[PDB]
Design an enzyme around this catalytic site. Structure first.
Site, PDB file in Angstrom:
ATOM      1  N   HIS A  45     -26.308  26.338 -15.083  1.00 30.39           N
ATOM      2  CA  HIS A  45     -24.869  26.493 -15.342  1.00 30.39           C
ATOM      3  C   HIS A  45     -24.534  27.078 -16.706  1.00 30.39           C
ATOM      4  CE1 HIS A  45     -24.841  22.394 -17.201  1.00 30.39           C
ATOM      5  NE2 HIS A  45     -23.849  22.906 -17.908  1.00 30.39           N
ATOM      6  N   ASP A  93     -30.138  22.701 -11.089  1.00 32.26           N
ATOM      7  CA  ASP A  93     -29.538  23.129 -12.351  1.00 32.26           C
ATOM      8  C   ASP A  93     -30.642  23.372 -13.375  1.00 32.26           C
ATOM      9  OD1 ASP A  93     -27.595  23.896 -14.181  1.00 32.26           O
ATOM     10  OD2 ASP A  93     -26.688  21.925 -14.405  1.00 32.26           O
ATOM     11  N   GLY A 186     -22.072  20.897 -24.480  1.00 33.50           N
ATOM     12  CA  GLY A 186     -22.838  21.613 -25.483  1.00 33.50           C
ATOM     13  C   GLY A 186     -24.267  21.104 -25.539  1.00 33.50           C
ATOM     14  N   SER A 188     -25.805  20.367 -22.637  1.00 34.15           N
ATOM     15  CA  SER A 188     -26.310  20.918 -21.375  1.00 34.15           C
ATOM     16  C   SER A 188     -27.422  21.922 -21.573  1.00 34.15           C
ATOM     17  CB  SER A 188     -25.076  21.516 -20.719  1.00 34.15           C
ATOM     18  OG  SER A 188     -24.390  20.461 -19.962  1.00 34.15           O
ATOM     19  N   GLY A 189     -28.448  21.807 -20.736  1.00 32.38           N
ATOM     20  CA  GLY A 189     -29.591  22.693 -20.831  1.00 32.38           C
ATOM     21  C   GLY A 189     -30.673  22.145 -21.729  1.00 32.38           C
TER      22      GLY A 189
END
Ligand SMILES: O=CCCNCC(=O)O
Length: 240
Positions: A45, A93, A186, A188-189
């Site tokens: 995402h 994801d 922020g 995320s990942g």
């Protein structure tokens, strides 16, 4: 990261900052994990928008020059084929980013240790989330890399009614939910570092939090389970 403490400069050398171009400057959007000298593991995402991305390794402070950073462009983006932008709850994801140049390894830049395929952590397993994400719900990004202790919440408890329900899949890891500590926008990942047999391994890629807030009781931060994608990760690196 809500309820976090500032991480030591050399504690999480695999953590990277995924940034996008905004005018004459660059802005942090997501975290990631350096898995090869020329490959970064992040959330799918994070790369949904058609922006210009760069990866920063050896980063501690986003607003100041640490004198340890290496800036590299993203050459190729390989998102999981089953990823659906309209359905974050379906899973998948995860995305791999091939870097334009291979980064140099030192005490601030190291490869993230990935868990063995199929590894599922027992309930309340010791973990730490890291990132520059919001320090409070609807707050602002952290200047310095933050860390927070987020113990795992197994599938049975996390997929129960009072928690996430059918939203969480077995292809995901849940951690936290104490109401004080959590991941936020922020983060995320980014990685979820978990202690297994004395070594920290990246068991999760930060995926989502509650729409009501980041640090909500019984709504742990949800991560893509890295151990479910080892074959996929190896296949992408081998073909590209
Ligand atoms: O869900 C993770 C935090 C928000 N990520 C938005 C983005 O940068 O794509």
């Amino acid at each position: 990261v809500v309820g976090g403490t500032e991480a030591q400069r050399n504690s999480w050398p695999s953590q990277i900052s995924l940034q996008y171009r905004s005018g004459s400057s660059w802005a942090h959007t997501c975290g990631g994990t350096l898995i090869r000298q020329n490959w970064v593991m992040t959330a799918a995402h994070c790369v949904d928008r058609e922006l210009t991305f760069r990866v920063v390794v050896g980063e501690h402070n986003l607003n100041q020059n640490d004198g340890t950073e290496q800036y590299v462009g993203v050459q190729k983006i390989v998102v999981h084929p089953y990823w659906n932008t309209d359905d974050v709850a379906a899973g998948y994801d995860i995305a791999l980013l091939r870097l334009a140049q291979s980064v140099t390894l030192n005490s601030y830049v190291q490869l993230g240790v990935l868990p063995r395929a199929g590894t599922i952590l027992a309930n309340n397993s010791p973990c730490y989330i890291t990132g520059w994400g919001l320090t409070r719900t609807n707050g602002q990004l952290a200047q310095t890399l933050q860390q927070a202790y987020l113990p795992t919440v197994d599938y049975a408890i996390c997929s129960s009614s009072s928690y996430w329900g059918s939203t969480v899949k077995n292809s995901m890891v849940c951690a936290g939910g104490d109401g004080v500590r959590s991941g936020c926008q922020g983060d995320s990942g980014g990685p979820l570092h978990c202690l297994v047999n004395g070594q920290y391994a990246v068991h999760g890629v930060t995926s989502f939090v509650s729409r009501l807030g980041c640090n909500v009781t019984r709504k742990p931060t949800v991560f893509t389970r890295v151990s479910a994608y080892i074959s996929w990760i190896n296949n992408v690196i081998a073909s590209n």
